[PDB]
Design an enzyme around this catalytic site. Structure first.
Site, PDB file in Angstrom:
ATOM      1  N   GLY B   8       0.797  -1.216   0.000  1.00 58.09           N
ATOM      2  CA  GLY B   8       0.000   0.000   0.000  1.00 58.09           C
ATOM      3  C   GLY B   8       0.813   1.239   0.000  1.00 58.09           C
ATOM      4  CG  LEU B  10       2.030   3.837  -5.237  1.00 58.82           C
ATOM      5  CD1 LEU B  10       1.364   3.840  -6.618  1.00 58.82           C
ATOM      6  CD2 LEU B  10       3.430   4.309  -5.282  1.00 58.82           C
ATOM      7  CD  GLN B  12      -1.968  11.617   4.602  1.00 56.76           C
ATOM      8  OE1 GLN B  12      -3.092  11.193   4.731  1.00 56.76           O
ATOM      9  NE2 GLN B  12      -1.509  12.592   5.305  1.00 56.76           N
ATOM     10  CE1 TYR B 143      -9.398   2.465   8.335  1.00 56.64           C
ATOM     11  CE2 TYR B 143     -10.274   4.399   9.476  1.00 56.64           C
ATOM     12  CZ  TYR B 143      -9.217   3.691   9.029  1.00 56.64           C
ATOM     13  OH  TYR B 143      -7.981   4.155   9.171  1.00 56.64           O
ATOM     14  CB  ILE B 173      -1.296  10.955   9.419  1.00 54.69           C
ATOM     15  CG1 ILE B 173      -1.340   9.809  10.429  1.00 54.69           C
ATOM     16  CG2 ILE B 173       0.122  11.315   9.015  1.00 54.69           C
ATOM     17  CD1 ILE B 173      -0.842  10.157  11.817  1.00 54.69           C
TER      18      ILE B 173
HETATM   19  N1  LIG Z   1      -3.974   8.781   6.961  1.00 52.58           N
HETATM   20  C1  LIG Z   1      -4.342   8.657   8.275  1.00 52.58           C
HETATM   21  O1  LIG Z   1      -4.695   9.689   8.905  1.00 52.58           O
HETATM   22  C2  LIG Z   1      -4.380   7.355   8.917  1.00 52.58           C
HETATM   23  C3  LIG Z   1      -4.104   6.131   8.316  1.00 52.58           C
HETATM   24  N2  LIG Z   1      -4.075   4.944   9.026  1.00 52.58           N
HETATM   25  C4  LIG Z   1      -3.893   3.874   8.057  1.00 52.58           C
HETATM   26  O2  LIG Z   1      -2.651   3.683   7.560  1.00 52.58           O
HETATM   27  C5  LIG Z   1      -2.945   3.055   6.341  1.00 52.58           C
HETATM   28  C6  LIG Z   1      -2.395   3.663   5.106  1.00 52.58           C
HETATM   29  O3  LIG Z   1      -3.255   4.809   5.122  1.00 52.58           O
HETATM   30  P1  LIG Z   1      -3.142   6.061   4.021  1.00 52.58           P
HETATM   31  O4  LIG Z   1      -1.731   6.065   3.512  1.00 52.58           O
HETATM   32  O5  LIG Z   1      -3.636   7.340   4.634  1.00 52.58           O
HETATM   33  O6  LIG Z   1      -4.163   5.505   2.950  1.00 52.58           O
HETATM   34  P2  LIG Z   1      -4.182   5.873   1.387  1.00 52.58           P
HETATM   35  O7  LIG Z   1      -5.631   5.669   0.978  1.00 52.58           O
HETATM   36  O8  LIG Z   1      -3.574   7.297   1.154  1.00 52.58           O
HETATM   37  O9  LIG Z   1      -3.253   4.664   0.771  1.00 52.58           O
HETATM   38  C7  LIG Z   1      -3.832   3.353   0.683  1.00 52.58           C
HETATM   39  C8  LIG Z   1      -2.907   2.768  -0.394  1.00 52.58           C
HETATM   40  O10 LIG Z   1      -3.257   1.355  -0.506  1.00 52.58           O
HETATM   41  C9  LIG Z   1      -3.372   0.970  -1.812  1.00 52.58           C
HETATM   42  N3  LIG Z   1      -4.279  -0.191  -2.000  1.00 52.58           N
HETATM   43  C10 LIG Z   1      -5.634  -0.257  -1.899  1.00 52.58           C
HETATM   44  N4  LIG Z   1      -5.997  -1.543  -2.163  1.00 52.58           N
HETATM   45  C11 LIG Z   1      -4.893  -2.262  -2.289  1.00 52.58           C
HETATM   46  C12 LIG Z   1      -4.690  -3.598  -2.603  1.00 52.58           C
HETATM   47  N5  LIG Z   1      -5.742  -4.372  -2.821  1.00 52.58           N
HETATM   48  N6  LIG Z   1      -3.451  -4.109  -2.753  1.00 52.58           N
HETATM   49  C13 LIG Z   1      -2.376  -3.245  -2.590  1.00 52.58           C
HETATM   50  N7  LIG Z   1      -2.586  -1.859  -2.340  1.00 52.58           N
HETATM   51  C14 LIG Z   1      -3.844  -1.416  -2.189  1.00 52.58           C
HETATM   52  C15 LIG Z   1      -3.908   2.225  -2.501  1.00 52.58           C
HETATM   53  O11 LIG Z   1      -3.644   2.184  -3.927  1.00 52.58           O
HETATM   54  C16 LIG Z   1      -3.075   3.180  -1.808  1.00 52.58           C
HETATM   55  O12 LIG Z   1      -2.019   3.789  -2.456  1.00 52.58           O
HETATM   56  C17 LIG Z   1      -4.206   2.336   6.546  1.00 52.58           C
HETATM   57  O13 LIG Z   1      -4.246   1.056   7.051  1.00 52.58           O
HETATM   58  C18 LIG Z   1      -5.001   3.308   7.165  1.00 52.58           C
HETATM   59  O14 LIG Z   1      -6.072   2.743   7.949  1.00 52.58           O
HETATM   60  C19 LIG Z   1      -4.672   4.840  10.246  1.00 52.58           C
HETATM   61  C20 LIG Z   1      -4.877   6.021  10.883  1.00 52.58           C
HETATM   62  C21 LIG Z   1      -4.550   7.294  10.353  1.00 52.58           C
HETATM   63  C1  LIG Z   2      -7.947   8.887  11.138  1.00 54.16           C
HETATM   64  C2  LIG Z   2      -7.755   7.876   9.990  1.00 54.16           C
HETATM   65  O1  LIG Z   2      -8.305   6.594  10.260  1.00 54.16           O
HETATM   66  C3  LIG Z   2      -8.299   8.439   8.694  1.00 54.16           C
HETATM   67  N1  LIG Z   2      -7.541   9.670   8.325  1.00 54.16           N
HETATM   68  C4  LIG Z   2      -9.754   8.772   8.678  1.00 54.16           C
HETATM   69  O2  LIG Z   2     -10.069   9.994   8.787  1.00 54.16           O
HETATM   70  O3  LIG Z   2     -10.496   7.821   8.462  1.00 54.16           O
END
Ligand SMILES: NC(=O)C1=CN([C@@H]2O[C@H](COP(=O)(O)OP(=O)(O)OC[C@H]3O[C@@H](n4cnc5c(N)ncnc54)[C@H](O)[C@@H]3O)[C@@H](O)[C@H]2O)C=CC1
Ligand SMILES: C[C@@H](O)[C@H](N)C(=O)O
Ligand SMILES: NC(=O)C1=CN([C@@H]2O[C@H](COP(=O)(O)OP(=O)(O)OC[C@H]3O[C@@H](n4cnc5c(N)ncnc54)[C@H](O)[C@@H]3O)[C@@H](O)[C@H]2O)C=CC1
Ligand SMILES: C[C@@H](O)[C@H](N)C(=O)O
Ligand code: NA
Ligand code: NA
Lengths: 321, 320
Positions: B8, B10, B12, B143, B173
């Site tokens: 995953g 690519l 944020q 979620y 984040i």
């Molecule tokens: N951004 C935030 O504020 C927070 C994020 N986290 C988490 O950290 C993680 C990463 O989050 P973000 O980077 O913000 O999400 P994002 O949505 O920016 O990145 C998710 C990435 O996963 C990839 N993806 C989706 N399906 C996939 C698959 N089937 N196989 C391989 N890749 C796949 C997408 O193409 C993508 O680039 C998650 O597990 C999310 O719950 C948890 C809390 C805070």
């Molecule tokens: C907080 C984290 O899980 C995500 N940025 C959301 O708003 O769902």
């Protein structure tokens, strides 16, 4: 009007007695019972109309059956339980997660009041082991328990998001005579009655003073019906603890020996059931269930043991007197 | 020096995490993957060790892990709060099944596995002020539901098989490099963009709804630190961590202090608001501080200064 009731995973321990009770209560034409297996020759639902085959992992076939029967209630019972799930975890995660997903979707799309049971196995050693509350820390030690936490939460979300009338209880260990149990930690109790009637040594995998919440099937059936008959307005929550009474293997043994007037031979040799059971609460707080929809329990351990020692020979052909 | 796989990658978090890992451990020791290929302006485009992998293809996921032999994995794919409520079947497929596949590979191939949880895993019974690590979990989003499953499943893998599963519950984040993926906290990033373009910002979270947040550099410090920690320091598998809490009106004030320009913001009770309102206002992360030394450098104003400096540079928006 009387409900139209679909039971899935209906041929197992709970399903067998529930299906019989629903057909009796509502009429056979108002009940459809289904399972991935056929009733065996000795099964009480053998040769009856209104008994179908359905693998609930086949979402398209599940929908077809719901479309055709048009249920207003569904009791979704398939799950792989604690001991077996630890040995077959991939199977437990497939059945316990995906069948539930499919059942909830169909309750959504077809406006069905849906019951999915949870379990004392959803709790772990952080829950508060005495008079465990309905809302507490859940840290299940088995993949079954993990999947039943997911079930409770996912059903609750379906209720909040879509208005699906999802209802559940956390069942204790269920004791019955009709259909043998499906590989949980509480299974020893049923097996100790059979050993006592056969006059064979019982090898018990749960240690003698390990107390667990338990319930006898007649009380369980009354509650499963009662919670589904209740108006939605009366329910303050979607998931309720219920209990019957707690006992340990030593207490079960004393009760059977009182009834048979006859000492039974038991060897306690720890099995995986032990460490599983040891992580579960010793008793539950079921006040919310008693207050909102009238849960109650009429059997105590001696009543149960009299009834089991009568029914097992009748249903299974073991030596009686 | 570990060999680190990021799935995953690519998104944020992955974009910045991947760069940080390559810089610390060497590009040769870091393999990253995603279901999508990066576009020409992605920070990871043109780099070696960036592969196309759908983590729902269990045989492909297994092939990659077997060849690379990671000692550490960060499994990041998930559908987050707002998007998951709109696309719940996708959330349930990705958040449950890819997690199951990741844990099974960690078991079979001896990998230290990090899978993030989230403040979304809490709901309105958690105790919303200084929320504890162990409390009632009643998430109001699919979620969140799937992230409670992830925590409990990962913990079961540790108890049953000895798998070294590690998790933190991340706050919202904030970062400049890669736009966010459809969570409720996304307004914060979008407000910095609106401020730099001088457009009206329509914020779907009400002005005083405060949430736990953290700036990316602190996030990256902690994501590495938790994974470096020896097991003897860890008393838990899942830790709360936080940076600082803020509301949209607080953010707006921080941005206006930097730019000396007022931003036009209209507040509305959007889908994000009903979600955010169910989550904690602040977290207790004392266990993480005590066990493995989680620490935070940025406050809201330092964060805002850095974001307003970086978005123009990284995305071409007008500066100052
Ligand atoms: N951004 C935030 O504020 C927070 C994020 N986290 C988490 O950290 C993680 C990463 O989050 P973000 O980077 O913000 O999400 P994002 O949505 O920016 O990145 C998710 C990435 O996963 C990839 N993806 C989706 N399906 C996939 C698959 N089937 N196989 C391989 N890749 C796949 C997408 O193409 C993508 O680039 C998650 O597990 C999310 O719950 C948890 C809390 C805070
Ligand atoms: C907080 C984290 O899980 C995500 N940025 C959301 O708003 O769902
Ligand atoms: N027996 C008990 O003490 C307790 C049971 N409950 C639960 O109540 C349920 C029913 O439990 P039991 O009757 O004891 O289990 P059981 O193992 O006796 O019966 C389960 C039935 O499900 C069917 N099944 C399995 N996979 C299926 C599939 N893919 N599609 C359709 N049917 C399938 C089986 O063939 C079987 O007849 C479960 O959800 C279980 O967790 C919970 C707590 C207590
Ligand atoms: C208690 C219930 O979940 C089941 N009979 C078990 O022992 O797994
Ligand atoms: Na116990
Ligand atoms: Na909040």
């Amino acid at each position: 009007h009387m409900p139209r009731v679909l039971v899935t995973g209906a041929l197992g321990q709970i399903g067998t007695d529930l299906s019989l009770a629903l057909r009796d209560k509502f009429g056979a034409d108002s009940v459809l019972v289904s399972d991935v297996v056929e009733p065996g020759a000795k099964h009480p639902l053998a040769g009856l109309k209104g008994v179908e085959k359905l693998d609930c992992l086949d979402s398209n076939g599940f929908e077809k059956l719901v479309k055709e029967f048009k249920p207003t209630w569904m009791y979704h019972l398939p799950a792989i339980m604690s001991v077996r799930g630890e040995a077959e975890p991939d199977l437990a995660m497939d059945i316990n997660v995906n069948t539930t997903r499919y059942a909830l979707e169909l309750a959504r799309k077809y406006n069905i009041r849906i019951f999915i049971p949870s379990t004392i196995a959803a709790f772990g050693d952080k829950c508060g082991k005495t008079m465990t509350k309905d809302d507490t820390i859940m840290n299940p030690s088995t993949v079954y328990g993990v999947t039943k936490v997911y079930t409770e939460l996912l059903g609750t979300w379906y209720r909040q998001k879509y208005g699906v009338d999802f209802r559940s209880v956390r069942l204790p260990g269920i004791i019955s005579a009709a259909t043998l149990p499906g590989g949980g930690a509480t299974d020893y109790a049923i097996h100790m009655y059979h050993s006592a009637l056969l006059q064979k040594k019982c090898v018990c995998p749960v240690l003698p003073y390990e107390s667990l919440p338990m319930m006898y099937m007649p009380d369980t059936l009354n509650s499963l019906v009662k919670i589904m008959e209740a108006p939605l307005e009366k329910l303050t929550r979607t998931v309720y603890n219920i209990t019957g009474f707690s006992f340990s293997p030593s207490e079960l043994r004393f009760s059977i020996e009182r009834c048979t007037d006859r000492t039974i031979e038991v060897e306690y040799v720890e099995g995986p059931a032990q460490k599983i059971a040891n992580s579960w609460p010793d008793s539950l707080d079921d006040s919310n269930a008693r207050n909102d929809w009238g849960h109650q329990v009429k059997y105590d351990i001696d009543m149960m043991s009299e009834d089991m020692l009568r029914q097992i020979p009748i249903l299974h052909g073991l030596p009686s007197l």
